[PDB]
Amino acid sequence: LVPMVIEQTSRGERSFDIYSRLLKERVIFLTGQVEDHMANLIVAQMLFLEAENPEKDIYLYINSPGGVITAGMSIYDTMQFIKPDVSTICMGQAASMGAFLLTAGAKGKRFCLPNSRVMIHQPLGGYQGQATDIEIHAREILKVKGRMNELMALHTGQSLEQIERDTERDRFLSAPEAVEYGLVDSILTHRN
Amino acid sequence: LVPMVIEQTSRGERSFDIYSRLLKERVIFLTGQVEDHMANLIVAQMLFLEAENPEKDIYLYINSPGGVITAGMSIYDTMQFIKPDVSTICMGQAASMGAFLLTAGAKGKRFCLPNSRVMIHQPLGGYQGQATDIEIHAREILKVKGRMNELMALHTGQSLEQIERDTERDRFLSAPEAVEYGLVDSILTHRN
Amino acid sequence: LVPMVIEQTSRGERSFDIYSRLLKERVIFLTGQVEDHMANLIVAQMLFLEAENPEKDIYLYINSPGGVITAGMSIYDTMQFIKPDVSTICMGQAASMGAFLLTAGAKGKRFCLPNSRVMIHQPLGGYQGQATDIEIHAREILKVKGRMNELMALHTGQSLEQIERDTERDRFLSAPEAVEYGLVDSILTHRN
Amino acid sequence: LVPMVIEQTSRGERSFDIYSRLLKERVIFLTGQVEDHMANLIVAQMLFLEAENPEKDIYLYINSPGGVITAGMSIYDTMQFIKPDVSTICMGQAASMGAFLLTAGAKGKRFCLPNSRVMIHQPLGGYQGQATDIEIHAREILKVKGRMNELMALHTGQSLEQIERDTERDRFLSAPEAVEYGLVDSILTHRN
């Protein structure tokens, strides 16, 4: 069960939820498999915060094992659209989609904890049916691979060729190793 | 699960869920598979919004892997019926019914994010039973296919022949390609 | 999740549900399969509205795919019993029971959207057991068939012979065709 | 989802559910299969209304397909015990328990809608075990049949022999036919 917390204000005191209370502090949590339902929830949170203060930064804690690509693009496009900078923090795990959203944060604000694992691989898919349909779907997923690799190369700063060879198979990276590739800029070992 | 937010007002402040807060700002979310239950919910939201202000626009965010045809048409008719213009924005994914509802928005108010995929294909169905019953159902679905193509050509502007040949099989389109066809009018990448 | 809306009144602001908010405007939603549970809810809603003001017409939207005939007749008998006129609007789909309740609205107050679909067929059923019991159930369902056809002919105006012939097999009717058959009176395309 | 309605009173406006609002008007709903859980709920409502006004009649709607006998004998005993007359209105379907609870209403205050269906059959059961136990259970179910057959004859006015010859096998009766046997008194078609 989610615990409740009371916030003291001049008007009085109201009982907020633990996740809702942190939303006031511009903190969003990306946990579990990425899907359309949870993606829209994160999208709405970003837009709401932008209206409250288009200058203050937003903190996004990413602890996910991956998910649907389309649901992730809905979040990536929203981050690059809103004015405030989105600070991405890698908490525990960051898979293919999680790592993509981890390196899509504002430059100099992509943090990672020391004991965190980061994995980047090739998109997964499949289809069953006629040969004509298979090639149609096959060419679509291939475009996503190159389209995603191009974006990752932009944020990380590495060459497209290097990204293609690294993302061919599962590539596990640690917090120090991630800084070398460019996915993250600094490691958060202790506050201040 | 669903975060709660507050809306500071002159008299005081009231608590709302993230989805209902955006509804006050004339924003409707169309997420997941389309069915009668969620479609009627969207219909109610559209009707309620036009009553508060029949002149302001309504924003409909679309992210869904298609759904039922009958449920979707209920939304299409409702959009074309109400006086205010309905702006459609595609976030992540737009399938057969989602794309039809995306291009059904008002002219110059159909947007899409740069990293978004759009798919259009002919309706699919089936019926088991006697030959006579199969024939009756076959004619119905065929008429639906024609009507859907006619409406798509109206909003997109392409010829009926082009739509028939393009939608014969799955056709994936990106944000720039969607603009050429006529499904959308512009692409949103950054604010201002 | 069902959105929550706020209504500003002389006495102040009240937070209602989207479905309950429309109930105040003499609007009832008939969505999904017809069963005893949802039928009783619609019956209660009709009676409540009648007590408030039995002079204003009641609006009943119909996006149902059909259901049991016992629960459907409960709604039909309530519609013809109450003093106010029940205006039915077909949104998306109207099946056997959904079309029997659409044509059972006040004359001149039956509407259908341009892309709505209507289907009418004879009752379905079955029973297992002794031949004697089958004879009892076989004659009972036949009476329902003849009774439903009689009521269908009354509202539509078509001869009982035509109704029986057209109901033998599934018959699909579009919004314009339904106007000629007598199921509906007008088509709503654009406001005003 | 049950809609919420508002009631205007001298003290102020109060929000209640549709079912609770009708309860204030001495209206009880009997829907679905009969069981111990729902039976106790109806018993509580009857007892509560009796204390509020032991001289005002109570209305009990019956849209149920039947159920447990014991669950239905509590409601029957509760209706015959309380002083106020309990009116019964058949809405759609009334099976063995529903019909037994429809004819048990106060003489002169029983109603059946024009297109309602009433079915009466004999009690169903069964037991698996030793022959000695089968005899014990067989004798008991035969006593319930005789007991229920006698109660129906008292409330309908037909001879016990006729009830035995008419309840042996399923007997479907329309509203006009029920008036001739005694299960109901009049048929409600319009307000006046």
Add this chain to the structure above:
Amino acid sequence: LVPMVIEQTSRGERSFDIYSRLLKERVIFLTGQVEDHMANLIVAQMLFLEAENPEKDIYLYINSPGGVITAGMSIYDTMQFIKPDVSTICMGQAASMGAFLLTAGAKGKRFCLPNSRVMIHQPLGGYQGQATDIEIHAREILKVKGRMNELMALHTGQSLEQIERDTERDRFLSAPEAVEYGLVDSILTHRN
């Protein structure tokens, strides 16, 4: 869905549940199969009622098909422990456990409806394992059998020998027959 009721007093209006409202009137409901979760709930209600007025009687409505022996004994011990008298009323059915808790009420305050059914039988059980373990459980259940019969004879006023012979197998007793056996004192037919 449990309906909500209103209680008018010179303290302010309070909305209560149908079951909670009756609790204030010293009425406790015993419905469904007896188990530990519901038994502990009934026990809590009894201890709370005696705190408000340890002199007034507590009414217990019994409509259940039986249950666990341990759970029932928890209620039995609590009934005979509290100072106020526990009035037992049988509506519907009362099985082995339900009958034990029925006859366990205060002498002269046990009631039964005219069409209620009562059943009494020996306890059930079983164990799978080693022979030595079977003897342990076999003797334990036998002790319970004798203990239940002794308590049954005490309240019913019959001899221990008669109870054993009658409870050897299922024995169904109607309301008039239960009075002769001693399980109840009187029968409630109408409110005099």
Add this chain to the structure above:
Amino acid sequence: LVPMVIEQTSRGERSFDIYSRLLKERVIFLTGQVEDHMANLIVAQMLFLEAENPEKDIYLYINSPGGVITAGMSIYDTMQFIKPDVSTICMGQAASMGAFLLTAGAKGKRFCLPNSRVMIHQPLGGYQGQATDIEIHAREILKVKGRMNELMALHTGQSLEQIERDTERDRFLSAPEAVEYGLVDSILTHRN
């Protein structure tokens, strides 16, 4: 459904659940199987009750079929750690963990109902894997049995050898036999 209750206080009337209301009176319910989630809830209640008055006794009603040893020990350690004495009352059934937690109460405050059953046996478990792993788990559970028997002998007063032999297999004890064994100090039959 958990009933609600009203508590009259200086500030006015406060609504509480039946379980929460009894918690205010320093009463904790241990129902069902003992698991981690349920145990932590009881621990939180004990710690919470200690803060208001560390000199007032705490009542723990035990009715359970048993559970995991780890979760039970958490409650046992908490009972001995907190300053206020914990009074254990057995209603219904008390298994291995229930009996262990029943005899762990304060000396002289361990009660039991006359028709309650107490069962004690050795721990259960198992492991599937390599012989080396089995040896580790085999020695672990053996130490737990010895550690549990040592504590049981301390509270009951019996010798360690007697506890070992008596717990080799399931041993059922009644309320009087429990007093002789030392598991409880008194039996509650009637108020005062």
Add this chain to the structure above:
Amino acid sequence: LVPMVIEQTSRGERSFDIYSRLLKERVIFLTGQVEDHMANLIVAQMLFLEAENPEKDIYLYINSPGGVITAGMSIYDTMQFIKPDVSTICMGQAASMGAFLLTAGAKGKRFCLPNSRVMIHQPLGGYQGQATDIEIHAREILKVKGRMNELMALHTGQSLEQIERDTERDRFLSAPEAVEYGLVDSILTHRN
């Protein structure tokens, strides 16, 4: 199910949950299998408490059988990152991940109840696929094994070689033995 409590203060009365009430006192419960959802909730509780007062210690009660490594390490990095010291108390059981989060508390603030068990072992895993893929996952889990052992030796104070041999297989440790190894600093048996 979950009991509610009230906190009486000069301001008034506030209804709080048992878990929420303890959260005000900087107490977090780690119950059940470790996973992303529960771990994220714990992290939110830590961050919220840090905002209230970054100088007050936080108490974490651990009772769990272990779980996912990634979810667990998120809590570890969060405990060391925040400025306040986190006190860990072992109640009942502490498995591989639970023990790692136990010894990870602040020095001199790691407690364990006397009747508690602690287990430590190497991480578990697996992967099905191509040989080259197995090598990647096989090499990655080995790093986690060594990485986790390095942290255990740092907090416990033992040598890496000793930890490797001890964690090769399941090693059960009691409260007194845990103090010797350094997993905890003191044992809490009685208050003061």
Add this chain to the structure above:
Amino acid sequence: LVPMVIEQTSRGERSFDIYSRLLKERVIFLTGQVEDHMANLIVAQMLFLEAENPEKDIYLYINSPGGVITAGMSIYDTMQFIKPDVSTICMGQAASMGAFLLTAGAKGKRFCLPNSRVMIHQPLGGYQGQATDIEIHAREILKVKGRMNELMALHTGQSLEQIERDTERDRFLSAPEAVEYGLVDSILTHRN
């Protein structure tokens, strides 16, 4: 698929399954679970062999993980009834039924392999139903325990008390240990 072996006969050649050929040598195999269907087959073999030669001994191999108790008794009784001595040899291991049959062999004809394990335990069973029926089945299986122990003591030349004490729980015995216990006579080393 049993391998066939062609042994020349009077005709000149005849193929016989491995089991059929060994049957001529008075060799019976006991494999898998013991049930009525399998038991009668062995009895048929022994009876047939007796007709062939009522003096020559019949070699019997016992390798099975126990089975039905009643099935074994038929084989046991047949062995003592027939005149030829039945030598019993255990291969791999001996279970409850196997050990009982192993010691049932003629004195001086019971042997075992160097690496074999013998396990003896009390009979297992269970029943579900009324208490009166449990006592009947509980006493029936109890007699079997005593009866089986008496027969085992007679053949093993051990006191009945030792058999009862050692048969309370599973007791594994190696080949040399079985010799000292009287179950067998001597181990079988290399031939000659």
Add this chain to the structure above:
Amino acid sequence: LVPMVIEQTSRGERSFDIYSRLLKERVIFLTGQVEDHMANLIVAQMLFLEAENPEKDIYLYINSPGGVITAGMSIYDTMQFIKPDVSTICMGQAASMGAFLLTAGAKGKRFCLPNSRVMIHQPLGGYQGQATDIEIHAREILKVKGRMNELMALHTGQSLEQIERDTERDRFLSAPEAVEYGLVDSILTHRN
């Protein structure tokens, strides 16, 4: 389907299953999981060959993934009991049981194919029940672990301590490694 191999014997050309044909050449095949049914069949085959000639070597093939431990001991003891020396050969792979039965052959006639693998590990078991029963089964399997190590060490020739260390975890040995380890004599690369 098994192919029919023809052999012109004294009788004449008569086909037999390929396995039966190889039986005449003193060749036994061990395939799949090892169980009592398959193990018993192997015992019948080897004993049959000994009768024909007790001084002619047998060419045994072992290609199995392991199985029941007790089923294998019967074969091992039988191999040493009979005078003929069994030449054990490994095809494809050798598992826990397969490897034990491989080195059991007479020294100097144990070979393996060029591309084959051998795996050795300690026994695997498990038990669920009381602590006393677990201790019994724990000691039983523990003795088996040491018993096999003694027999395997004797045939392999390696020290008991060295093999005990290697049998703790799975150890894979290729064809050349087995020769150096003393488990086999040589490798069969080509005929002659």
Add this chain to the structure above:
Amino acid sequence: SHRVETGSGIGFGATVKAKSDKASEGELLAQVEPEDLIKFGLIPEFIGRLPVVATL
């Protein structure tokens, strides 16, 4: 106490007042500050009108 010492009143590491420490209230009150009174409910204006404070 929640402002000058550990903010944990409930738990295994808290400090339950059961040692008959009658001095606790006196020493705690001596550390009173205006903010503490605000949490008690007293409006800021009233506190300002009462500059002198004496604990017993």
